[PDB]
Design an enzyme around this catalytic site. Structure first.
Site, PDB file in Angstrom:
ATOM      1  N   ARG A   1      55.404  45.438  57.054  1.00 51.74           N
ATOM      2  CA  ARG A   1      56.940  45.818  57.443  1.00 51.74           C
ATOM      3  C   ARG A   1      57.050  46.874  56.630  1.00 51.74           C
TER       4      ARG A   1
ATOM      5  N   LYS B   1      39.483  31.174  48.872  1.00 47.80           N
ATOM      6  CA  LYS B   1      39.537  32.293  48.932  1.00 47.80           C
ATOM      7  C   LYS B   1      38.110  33.418  48.673  1.00 47.80           C
TER       8      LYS B   1
ATOM      9  N   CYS C   1      45.162  26.410  44.097  1.00 46.24           N
ATOM     10  CA  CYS C   1      43.807  27.111  43.590  1.00 46.24           C
ATOM     11  C   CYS C   1      42.855  26.516  44.087  1.00 46.24           C
TER      12      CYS C   1
ATOM     13  N   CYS D   1      42.433  30.234  45.214  1.00 45.16           N
ATOM     14  CA  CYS D   1      41.570  31.042  44.439  1.00 45.16           C
ATOM     15  C   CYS D   1      40.054  30.571  44.843  1.00 45.16           C
TER      16      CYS D   1
ATOM     17  N   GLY E   1      56.713  12.105  43.596  1.00 44.93           N
ATOM     18  CA  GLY E   1      57.730  11.729  42.497  1.00 44.93           C
ATOM     19  C   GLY E   1      58.707  12.542  42.697  1.00 44.93           C
TER      20      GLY E   1
ATOM     21  N   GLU F   1      31.462  51.428  32.266  1.00 44.21           N
ATOM     22  CA  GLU F   1      31.214  52.491  31.164  1.00 44.21           C
ATOM     23  C   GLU F   1      31.886  53.821  31.265  1.00 44.21           C
TER      24      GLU F   1
ATOM     25  N   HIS G   1      24.845  51.510  29.733  1.00 41.82           N
ATOM     26  CA  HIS G   1      24.239  52.396  30.841  1.00 41.82           C
ATOM     27  C   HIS G   1      23.162  51.460  31.345  1.00 41.82           C
TER      28      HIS G   1
ATOM     29  N   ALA H   1      47.812  38.278  52.207  1.00 40.00           N
ATOM     30  CA  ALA H   1      47.431  38.791  53.362  1.00 40.00           C
ATOM     31  C   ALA H   1      46.134  39.610  53.495  1.00 40.00           C
ATOM     32  N   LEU H   2      46.113  40.388  52.507  1.00 36.88           N
ATOM     33  CA  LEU H   2      45.012  41.516  52.449  1.00 36.88           C
ATOM     34  C   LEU H   2      43.549  40.847  52.086  1.00 36.88           C
ATOM     35  N   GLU H   3      43.613  40.043  51.174  1.00 35.39           N
ATOM     36  CA  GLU H   3      42.433  39.418  51.028  1.00 35.39           C
ATOM     37  C   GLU H   3      41.863  38.695  52.278  1.00 35.39           C
TER      38      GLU H   3
ATOM     39  N   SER I   1      46.776  23.030  39.022  1.00 29.80           N
ATOM     40  CA  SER I   1      46.375  23.783  37.866  1.00 29.80           C
ATOM     41  C   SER I   1      47.013  23.501  36.625  1.00 29.80           C
ATOM     42  N   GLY I   2      48.192  23.488  36.504  1.00 20.26           N
ATOM     43  CA  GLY I   2      49.053  23.341  35.280  1.00 20.26           C
ATOM     44  C   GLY I   2      48.996  21.917  34.988  1.00 20.26           C
TER      45      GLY I   2
ATOM     46  N   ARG J   1      53.461  45.095  47.295  1.00 22.46           N
ATOM     47  CA  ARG J   1      54.937  45.537  46.503  1.00 22.46           C
ATOM     48  C   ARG J   1      54.778  44.813  45.237  1.00 22.46           C
TER      49      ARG J   1
ATOM     50  N   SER K   1      51.181  41.031  51.221  1.00 21.96           N
ATOM     51  CA  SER K   1      50.922  40.641  49.758  1.00 21.96           C
ATOM     52  C   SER K   1      49.298  40.562  49.458  1.00 21.96           C
ATOM     53  N   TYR K   2      48.888  40.155  48.445  1.00 25.13           N
ATOM     54  CA  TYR K   2      47.559  39.916  48.052  1.00 25.13           C
ATOM     55  C   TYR K   2      46.911  39.002  48.905  1.00 25.13           C
TER      56      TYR K   2
HETATM   57  C1  LIG Z   1      45.695  31.980  48.831  1.00 25.01           C
HETATM   58  C2  LIG Z   1      45.865  32.014  47.379  1.00 25.01           C
HETATM   59  C3  LIG Z   1      45.106  32.446  46.866  1.00 25.01           C
HETATM   60  C4  LIG Z   1      45.165  32.578  45.190  1.00 25.01           C
HETATM   61  N1  LIG Z   1      44.376  33.124  44.289  1.00 25.01           N
HETATM   62  C5  LIG Z   1      44.337  33.065  43.255  1.00 25.01           C
HETATM   63  C6  LIG Z   1      43.366  33.785  42.314  1.00 25.01           C
HETATM   64  O1  LIG Z   1      42.268  34.196  42.747  1.00 25.01           O
HETATM   65  N2  LIG Z   1      43.691  33.955  41.081  1.00 25.01           N
HETATM   66  C7  LIG Z   1      44.895  33.101  40.368  1.00 25.01           C
HETATM   67  O2  LIG Z   1      44.915  33.179  39.084  1.00 25.01           O
HETATM   68  N3  LIG Z   1      45.636  32.661  41.406  1.00 25.01           N
HETATM   69  C8  LIG Z   1      45.555  32.544  42.403  1.00 25.01           C
HETATM   70  N4  LIG Z   1      46.532  31.800  43.242  1.00 25.01           N
HETATM   71  C9  LIG Z   1      47.631  31.431  42.537  1.00 25.01           C
HETATM   72  C10 LIG Z   1      47.271  29.903  42.010  1.00 25.01           C
HETATM   73  O3  LIG Z   1      46.825  29.126  43.117  1.00 25.01           O
HETATM   74  C11 LIG Z   1      48.403  29.432  41.396  1.00 25.01           C
HETATM   75  O4  LIG Z   1      49.207  30.183  40.548  1.00 25.01           O
HETATM   76  C12 LIG Z   1      48.390  27.978  40.820  1.00 25.01           C
HETATM   77  O5  LIG Z   1      47.943  27.031  42.047  1.00 25.01           O
HETATM   78  C13 LIG Z   1      49.675  27.493  40.425  1.00 25.01           C
HETATM   79  O6  LIG Z   1      49.273  26.134  39.826  1.00 25.01           O
HETATM   80  P1  LIG Z   1      50.760  24.948  39.809  1.00 25.01           P
HETATM   81  O7  LIG Z   1      50.118  24.006  38.535  1.00 25.01           O
HETATM   82  O8  LIG Z   1      51.940  25.708  39.340  1.00 25.01           O
HETATM   83  O9  LIG Z   1      50.683  24.535  41.079  1.00 25.01           O
HETATM   84  P2  LIG Z   1      49.912  23.919  42.219  1.00 25.01           P
HETATM   85  O10 LIG Z   1      48.638  24.370  41.985  1.00 25.01           O
HETATM   86  O11 LIG Z   1      50.243  24.310  43.470  1.00 25.01           O
HETATM   87  O12 LIG Z   1      50.109  22.373  42.045  1.00 25.01           O
HETATM   88  C14 LIG Z   1      51.145  21.746  42.321  1.00 25.01           C
HETATM   89  C15 LIG Z   1      50.802  20.310  42.878  1.00 25.01           C
HETATM   90  O13 LIG Z   1      52.023  19.495  42.954  1.00 25.01           O
HETATM   91  C16 LIG Z   1      52.143  18.692  44.362  1.00 25.01           C
HETATM   92  N5  LIG Z   1      53.364  18.408  44.267  1.00 25.01           N
HETATM   93  C17 LIG Z   1      54.442  19.228  44.987  1.00 25.01           C
HETATM   94  N6  LIG Z   1      55.561  18.353  45.148  1.00 25.01           N
HETATM   95  C18 LIG Z   1      55.209  17.187  44.686  1.00 25.01           C
HETATM   96  C19 LIG Z   1      55.860  15.851  44.422  1.00 25.01           C
HETATM   97  N7  LIG Z   1      57.250  15.716  44.695  1.00 25.01           N
HETATM   98  N8  LIG Z   1      55.421  14.904  43.818  1.00 25.01           N
HETATM   99  C20 LIG Z   1      54.114  14.923  43.530  1.00 25.01           C
HETATM  100  N9  LIG Z   1      53.114  15.999  43.732  1.00 25.01           N
HETATM  101  C21 LIG Z   1      53.844  17.112  43.993  1.00 25.01           C
HETATM  102  C22 LIG Z   1      51.697  19.935  45.196  1.00 25.01           C
HETATM  103  O14 LIG Z   1      51.193  19.294  46.471  1.00 25.01           O
HETATM  104  C23 LIG Z   1      50.377  20.369  44.427  1.00 25.01           C
HETATM  105  O15 LIG Z   1      49.166  19.535  44.793  1.00 25.01           O
HETATM  106  C24 LIG Z   1      46.205  31.866  44.753  1.00 25.01           C
HETATM  107  C25 LIG Z   1      47.321  31.252  45.651  1.00 25.01           C
HETATM  108  C26 LIG Z   1      47.112  31.144  46.952  1.00 25.01           C
HETATM  109  C27 LIG Z   1      48.227  30.614  47.601  1.00 25.01           C
HETATM  110  C1  LIG Z   2      11.731  52.159  30.892  1.00 25.31           C
HETATM  111  C2  LIG Z   2      13.087  52.544  30.231  1.00 25.31           C
HETATM  112  C3  LIG Z   2      14.115  51.795  30.579  1.00 25.31           C
HETATM  113  C4  LIG Z   2      15.209  52.407  29.971  1.00 25.31           C
HETATM  114  N1  LIG Z   2      16.625  51.735  30.138  1.00 25.31           N
HETATM  115  C5  LIG Z   2      17.653  52.153  29.653  1.00 25.31           C
HETATM  116  C6  LIG Z   2      18.879  51.525  29.971  1.00 25.31           C
HETATM  117  O1  LIG Z   2      18.951  50.698  30.973  1.00 25.31           O
HETATM  118  N2  LIG Z   2      20.123  52.005  29.120  1.00 25.31           N
HETATM  119  C7  LIG Z   2      19.932  52.928  28.183  1.00 25.31           C
HETATM  120  O2  LIG Z   2      20.882  53.039  27.527  1.00 25.31           O
HETATM  121  N3  LIG Z   2      18.767  53.236  27.813  1.00 25.31           N
HETATM  122  C8  LIG Z   2      17.598  53.143  28.470  1.00 25.31           C
HETATM  123  N4  LIG Z   2      16.606  53.654  28.214  1.00 25.31           N
HETATM  124  C9  LIG Z   2      16.337  54.452  27.029  1.00 25.31           C
HETATM  125  C10 LIG Z   2      16.699  55.926  27.335  1.00 25.31           C
HETATM  126  O3  LIG Z   2      16.010  56.655  28.194  1.00 25.31           O
HETATM  127  C11 LIG Z   2      16.759  56.722  25.971  1.00 25.31           C
HETATM  128  O4  LIG Z   2      17.142  56.222  24.995  1.00 25.31           O
HETATM  129  C12 LIG Z   2      17.180  58.024  26.307  1.00 25.31           C
HETATM  130  O5  LIG Z   2      16.325  58.789  27.362  1.00 25.31           O
HETATM  131  C13 LIG Z   2      16.843  59.070  25.158  1.00 25.31           C
HETATM  132  O6  LIG Z   2      17.277  60.562  25.398  1.00 25.31           O
HETATM  133  P1  LIG Z   2      16.653  61.522  24.546  1.00 25.31           P
HETATM  134  O7  LIG Z   2      17.586  62.761  24.785  1.00 25.31           O
HETATM  135  O8  LIG Z   2      16.704  61.253  22.982  1.00 25.31           O
HETATM  136  O9  LIG Z   2      15.264  61.681  25.050  1.00 25.31           O
HETATM  137  P2  LIG Z   2      14.597  62.005  26.422  1.00 25.31           P
HETATM  138  O10 LIG Z   2      15.855  61.524  27.409  1.00 25.31           O
HETATM  139  O11 LIG Z   2      13.143  61.325  26.414  1.00 25.31           O
HETATM  140  O12 LIG Z   2      14.378  63.555  26.637  1.00 25.31           O
HETATM  141  C14 LIG Z   2      13.406  64.431  25.845  1.00 25.31           C
HETATM  142  C15 LIG Z   2      12.988  65.565  26.746  1.00 25.31           C
HETATM  143  O13 LIG Z   2      12.326  66.446  25.845  1.00 25.31           O
HETATM  144  C16 LIG Z   2      11.104  66.739  26.588  1.00 25.31           C
HETATM  145  N5  LIG Z   2      10.168  67.345  25.415  1.00 25.31           N
HETATM  146  C17 LIG Z   2       9.383  66.731  24.601  1.00 25.31           C
HETATM  147  N6  LIG Z   2       8.759  67.671  23.822  1.00 25.31           N
HETATM  148  C18 LIG Z   2       9.175  68.721  24.231  1.00 25.31           C
HETATM  149  C19 LIG Z   2       8.775  70.052  23.683  1.00 25.31           C
HETATM  150  N7  LIG Z   2       7.981  70.319  22.627  1.00 25.31           N
HETATM  151  N8  LIG Z   2       9.488  70.974  24.330  1.00 25.31           N
HETATM  152  C20 LIG Z   2      10.221  70.827  25.132  1.00 25.31           C
HETATM  153  N9  LIG Z   2      10.820  69.756  25.873  1.00 25.31           N
HETATM  154  C21 LIG Z   2       9.924  68.848  25.077  1.00 25.31           C
HETATM  155  C22 LIG Z   2      10.735  65.477  27.235  1.00 25.31           C
HETATM  156  O14 LIG Z   2       9.506  65.608  27.880  1.00 25.31           O
HETATM  157  C23 LIG Z   2      11.764  64.908  27.780  1.00 25.31           C
HETATM  158  O15 LIG Z   2      11.987  65.519  29.144  1.00 25.31           O
HETATM  159  C24 LIG Z   2      15.345  53.119  28.697  1.00 25.31           C
HETATM  160  C25 LIG Z   2      13.979  53.626  28.480  1.00 25.31           C
HETATM  161  C26 LIG Z   2      12.829  53.392  29.239  1.00 25.31           C
HETATM  162  C27 LIG Z   2      11.587  53.968  28.827  1.00 25.31           C
HETATM  163  C1  LIG Z   3      46.251  37.922  41.931  1.00 26.46           C
HETATM  164  O1  LIG Z   3      47.625  38.475  41.407  1.00 26.46           O
HETATM  165  C2  LIG Z   3      48.624  38.048  41.842  1.00 26.46           C
HETATM  166  C3  LIG Z   3      49.755  38.102  41.043  1.00 26.46           C
HETATM  167  O2  LIG Z   3      50.683  37.989  41.114  1.00 26.46           O
HETATM  168  N1  LIG Z   3      49.436  38.878  39.869  1.00 26.46           N
HETATM  169  C4  LIG Z   3      50.649  39.462  38.499  1.00 26.46           C
HETATM  170  C5  LIG Z   3      51.692  40.154  39.027  1.00 26.46           C
HETATM  171  C6  LIG Z   3      52.936  40.270  38.477  1.00 26.46           C
HETATM  172  C7  LIG Z   3      53.968  40.982  38.870  1.00 26.46           C
HETATM  173  C8  LIG Z   3      53.473  42.133  39.882  1.00 26.46           C
HETATM  174  C9  LIG Z   3      52.242  42.257  40.536  1.00 26.46           C
HETATM  175  C10 LIG Z   3      51.261  41.322  39.935  1.00 26.46           C
END
Ligand SMILES: Cc1cc2nc3c(=O)[nH]c(=O)nc-3n(C[C@H](O)[C@H](O)[C@H](O)COP(=O)(O)OP(=O)(O)OC[C@H]3O[C@@H](n4cnc5c(N)ncnc54)[C@H](O)[C@@H]3O)c2cc1C
Ligand SMILES: Cc1cc2nc3c(=O)[nH]c(=O)nc-3n(C[C@H](O)[C@H](O)[C@H](O)COP(=O)(O)OP(=O)(O)OC[C@H]3O[C@@H](n4cnc5c(N)ncnc54)[C@H](O)[C@@H]3O)c2cc1C
Ligand SMILES: COCC(=O)NCc1ccccc1
Ligand SMILES: COCC(=O)NCc1ccccc1
Ligand SMILES: COCC(=O)NCc1ccccc1
Ligand SMILES: COCC(=O)NCc1ccccc1
Lengths: 587, 588
Positions: free
Chosen positions: A312, A157, A149, A154, A223, A570, A565, A293-295, A112-113, A317, A290-291
């Site tokens: 253990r 996995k 990785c 990464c 190397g 949120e 929403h 193991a669990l993953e 990676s680096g 940890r 560790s992460y």
């Molecule tokens: C199972 C697992 C899951 C992980 N998941 C994540 C994740 O989701 N997210 C995340 O951010 N990190 C994750 N990591 C960590 C991530 O893999 C490492 O932090 C990262 O690979 C470290 O990069 P590096 O460049 O230090 O070394 P490496 O990526 O290990 O590369 C070093 C390379 O140098 C080579 N090398 C060694 N000695 C020599 C030599 N003498 N001459 C030439 N080449 C040599 C090695 O064989 C290797 O190819 C995970 C690690 C593991 C083990």
């Molecule tokens: C299809 C659709 C999808 C949407 N998706 C999203 C989304 O993903 N995220 C998001 O943030 N927003 C979304 N919106 C917008 C969101 O629904 C509105 O912004 C929000 O409901 C507005 O709230 P309000 O209190 O202004 O009115 P409303 O929630 O419309 O409530 C007003 C209420 O007052 C009642 N009322 C009206 N006249 C009277 C009266 N004279 N006496 C008594 N009661 C009355 C009405 O019948 C209604 O029940 C969506 C809207 C639509 C149409």
């Molecule tokens: C996937 O995350 C593995 C990792 O090493 N994250 C950073 C960390 C640093 C110190 C304690 C705990 C976590």
């Protein structure tokens, strides 16, 4: 001052042009260098606040104060007339290739680096070599270019995590109206591995192509640094030779540990072997907590495996222990068994792996609990996930003088420099740094820019966000609750928290397992010290908040921001229940 | 300053105690009020910067300067000895319930904003009524308490979107090793509607329980404001009566529009009808191009439907138009047909809806393209999504004096106050505000705190993030790229952008360069992030966190110094480097 920056930049850059954007003389020199295929760094002085003072300092090298000025490996080369003289006299290419060393940069380690550092360096004209070798596992597993990785970390996995997530997608589809019957659908391990390995193969190839297209020399060789500027390389045919480099970057990473018990190396495997395993593991024991193991246990259970984890002491940890316990409780309720407070003593072989018919073996695991009772159970596969470590004794001759710590990682300054001034270390072997792929990439790219383009930006290693991809994912940024209370005291800490239910879980039929919290410092305007979320897509939820925490977000910043929403994320924008109030966080 | 705040707070609060956390006399008064089940606001003077000045201004109302001091509806009630006297003499209950009006607060409308406002007000002792009524659609559809989002908006549309997303999850499972065969699986509309409606019913019930447990009076009645303090209510039995209230919150929302063409009201439907429709729509025409139109067409296509969208001019007017086109291109590539530059002229009925066998009818749609060519095609269902509007002429007698803008929404100050001093408006009817559920909720809660607990905090309506839940989702926060250039000029705007591929899409063999993100930045202001845009899966989860950083004034440098989480889609925002002005390709 400006003067000593300029000297470091000139001494270190391979090829650098000091220029101005509005000068047609510099433009003429640029288009010359482009036609000659000469790559170089460029410092536009009319875009720097103290460009005037830098111009004056250039004269200390060139005896001129005008622009353009071209330098090569610390030596002034000429102005516009002089550079065009070399070009038209076919003398330019020889001058830009003159060097004391075979390479401007040698990277040991192609992960990676290291790949990120090498590619970035080549963009500024540094002549670069990247060395990579994969030592095979005890059972013989090996893989291609790209590091831990890409090949055994990464990438595979999270792809197998996705295969496991899709099992619950199949179950949910029925409640949303789709006609399938989940109970009649099964999983095929080798079909999954073939697709995962095909994607990894495309990445191995892509990195080879990327190095070739950046004029980087790739050597599939082991190397070893034998002096500050000499790297001994060993071929696939055991041919040994020596290459020289000005700057050296160590980037060799780590490998899995085994416990010192009988049968461990002979009969168990690690994550190195799991991601290309040609047979389904069968009934599996995961040893460790560790992460990794669990993953691994998590997706194996979701594919339908019979999976046990031997712990253990505690889970995860070093992570927030309230969150770690919620992670484990979810797994235990959803089909992962745990052997708690338990360690192994020996692994005994009952059946050898059947390579021909593509079946696992059979093992007897013997261990004991802390209350003294014995553990004895049969498994087809035993996976060790008990930590990782570097082996720098293989990479580094003691006589070179690069200091290591008690764990065997390299002691570096805040700009990645080792105790040997031309030698740097990045990634997992840099002592004290978070061991993560995006940290290694940022360190490597930023270091290349400081060496070869006169950059000054350092990598910031604080408040780096993380995600554990267990069956229910856990994202975090900043301090755990216990670390904040230790640092500042319980009376100066306020924790806002809430359960939540994803809308997608309503029609699919649990109410109060997802959970989030903000750990805050009262005396500093309620600054957010740490953020924690247990739920689906936790990595996508957490990432954006890491920018706000980087900028010093407070609770009032979260309150005045409006939610989107309907989302899980949120719920962070309206938190109000405090732990000290004692009010329940349930929905 | 302080004295004008204290007078506004005392005049407006229903029941309020001025207190200090260390005073055992204040604690004794708090204990008596709790035992008598008297809810109230509390201001702790030892926790405010200018608590000493506040204590001194209290004397202008009570003629004393000590704590505790209890007020009811603008009247000083007493100190510790006096409150206990009233309690011991069984006089306190009648004092705290004395009022010129039936209610401290009447909320007209029981939706997102009104329910939030009413519950928050009741926590501070405001005697509150929430009015809600649902005028049935032209075909007769109606629903329960909770408003548009809960019943016919965000909640059912995202659940149907999720049913649609699961079709591609079923496809992807084969590539990840599972034994199913996507080709032999079909979808049952009525089973999904039953599950969606069961969840909506649990929300209807949960809100009635929440109002009961907060001592809020819920009236299922249609309200009309006939003077500043008088609300006329009409029953389900058409009984008419009048209730009075000190403060009034208008929160009545909007309803769908229909075009003025023959057959639209008689034979088409809207989103109000879609989410409880008892039969599958069948072959469907959606008329319109709002987020409502595109979201509904999107999930209907993913559930197997033959779907066409009739677009008058552009998609998503008012959203970033590069983003809107990428959204539409993805839908058109994945089975949504578009009739572009086209409007309808009439709907004719060919078959009546079949209630016996639970089946749609059949319609003939005639229209025309902008060049004059004709459109004519048959559909089983026609859905109009051509905007929404308030109906305030029904809610508000003209003589009350509440000013409306040219679109019929309420003109409000920055604290939601209308042109009538005791009347406020929140949610979709508040002119010029983003029309979203979390905005209505924040406005209603913050307003209730200012009215009844002395709060001063205002709602911030700027840079509110959004997400469009199309088959590929689109999240955004801040300015579109074209608005940024209009406001600052092209030379002052830099845009960083990149394609990306979700890791989940690799083994599934989905597209390499369809997902996309960009940051629109201001050069002369330290490269401030003016707008963020992302097209990809889980776009709402991606965008939400960045809205906090944009609120705080994030720059491109803040994105650069933050490290990514790997492997995620969101991490691509932390390493962006290709600018649009460079001309370099954004593909990976
Ligand atoms: C199972 C697992 C899951 C992980 N998941 C994540 C994740 O989701 N997210 C995340 O951010 N990190 C994750 N990591 C960590 C991530 O893999 C490492 O932090 C990262 O690979 C470290 O990069 P590096 O460049 O230090 O070394 P490496 O990526 O290990 O590369 C070093 C390379 O140098 C080579 N090398 C060694 N000695 C020599 C030599 N003498 N001459 C030439 N080449 C040599 C090695 O064989 C290797 O190819 C995970 C690690 C593991 C083990
Ligand atoms: C299809 C659709 C999808 C949407 N998706 C999203 C989304 O993903 N995220 C998001 O943030 N927003 C979304 N919106 C917008 C969101 O629904 C509105 O912004 C929000 O409901 C507005 O709230 P309000 O209190 O202004 O009115 P409303 O929630 O419309 O409530 C007003 C209420 O007052 C009642 N009322 C009206 N006249 C009277 C009266 N004279 N006496 C008594 N009661 C009355 C009405 O019948 C209604 O029940 C969506 C809207 C639509 C149409
Ligand atoms: C996937 O995350 C593995 C990792 O090493 N994250 C950073 C960390 C640093 C110190 C304690 C705990 C976590
Ligand atoms: C203090 O920790 C005691 C312990 O046994 N932790 C292991 C575990 C906890 C919860 C779920 C699964 C495993
Ligand atoms: C200027 O816009 C012209 C237009 O016809 N927009 C509609 C549309 C665009 C892309 C995909 C689907 C529909
Ligand atoms: C210009 O539009 C800004 C806005 O906030 N519109 C409301 C909305 C946005 C996104 C999805 C649904 C609704």
């Amino acid at each position: 001052g400006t003067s000593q920056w300029l000297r470091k930049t000139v001494d270190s850059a391979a090829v650098i042009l000091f220029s101005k954007t509005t000068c047609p003389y510099c433009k003429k020199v640029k288009d010359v260098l482009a036609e000659a295929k000469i790559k170089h760094a460029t410092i536009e002085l009319d875009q720097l606040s103290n460009g005037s003072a830098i111009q004056k300092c250039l004269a200390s090298f060139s005896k001129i104060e005008t622009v353009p000025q071209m330098f090569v490996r610390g030596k002034f080369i000429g102005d516009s007339q002089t550079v065009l003289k070399y070009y038209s006299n076919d003398e330019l290419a020889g001058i830009v290739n003159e060097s004391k060393y075979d390479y401007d940069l040698i990277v040991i380690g192609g992960g990676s680096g290291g790949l990120a550092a090498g590619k970035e360096a080549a963009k500024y004209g540094a002549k670069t070599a990247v060395l990579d070798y994969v030592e095979p596992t005890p059972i013989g597993t090996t893989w291609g270019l790209g590091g831990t990785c890409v090949n055994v970390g990464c990438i595979p996995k999270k792809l197998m995590h996705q295969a496991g997530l899709l099992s619950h997608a199949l179950e949910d589809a029925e409640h949303f109206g789709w006609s399938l019957d989940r109970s009649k659908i099964s999983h095929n391990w080798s079909t999954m591995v073939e697709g995962v390995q095909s994607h990894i193969g495309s990445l191995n190839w892509g990195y080879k192509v990327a190095l070739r297209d950046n004029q980087v020399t790739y050597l599939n060789a082991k190397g070893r640094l034998i002096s500050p500027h000499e790297v001994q390389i060993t071929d696939k045919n055991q041919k040994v030779s020596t290459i020289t480099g000005n700057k050296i970057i160590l980037a060799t990473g780590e490998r899995p540990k085994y416990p010192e018990i009988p049968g461990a190396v002979e009969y168990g495997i690690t994550s190195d072997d799991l991601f290309s395993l040609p047979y389904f593991p069968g009934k599996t024991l995961v040893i460790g907590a560790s992460y990794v193991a669990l993953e691994c246990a998590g997706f194996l259970a979701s594919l339908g495996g019979d999976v046990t984890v031997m712990v253990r002491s505690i889970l995860l940890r070093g992570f927030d222990q309230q969150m770690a316990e919620k992670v484990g409780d979810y797994m235990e309720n959803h089909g992962v068994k745990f052997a708690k407070l338990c360690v192994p003593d020996e692994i005994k072989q009952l059946k050898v792996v059947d390579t021909e018919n593509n079946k696992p073996g059979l093992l007897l695991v013997k261990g004991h609990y802390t209350d003294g009772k014995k553990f004895e159970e049969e498994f087809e596969t035993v996976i060790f996930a008990v930590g990782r470590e570097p082996q720098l004794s293989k990479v580094l001759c003691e006589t070179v003088g690069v200091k290591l710590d008690k764990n065997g990682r390299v002691v570096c300054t805040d700009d990645e420099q080792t105790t040997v001034s031309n030698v740097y270390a990045i990634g997992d072997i840099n002592a004290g740094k978070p061991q993560l792929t995006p940290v290694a990439i940022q360190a490597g790219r930023y270091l290349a820019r400081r060496l070869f383009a006169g950059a000054t930006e350092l990598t910031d290693y604080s408040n780096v966000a993380t995600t554990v991809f267990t069956p229910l994912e856990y994202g975090a940024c900043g301090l755990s609750e216990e670390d904040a209370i230790e640092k500042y005291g319980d009376k100066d800490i306020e924790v806002y928290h809430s359960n939540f239910k994803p809308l997608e879980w309503t029609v699919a039929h649990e109410d109060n397992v997802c959970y989030m919290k903000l750990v805050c410092r009262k005396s500093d305007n309620m600054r957010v010290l740490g953020l924690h979320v247990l739920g689906p897509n936790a990595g996508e939820i957490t990432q954006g908040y890491a920018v706000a925490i980087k900028m010093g977000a407070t609770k009032a910043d979260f309150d005045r921001t409006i939610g989107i929403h309907p989302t899980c994320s949120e719920t962070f924008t309206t938190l109000h229940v405090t732990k000290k109030s004692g009010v329940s966080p349930i929905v």
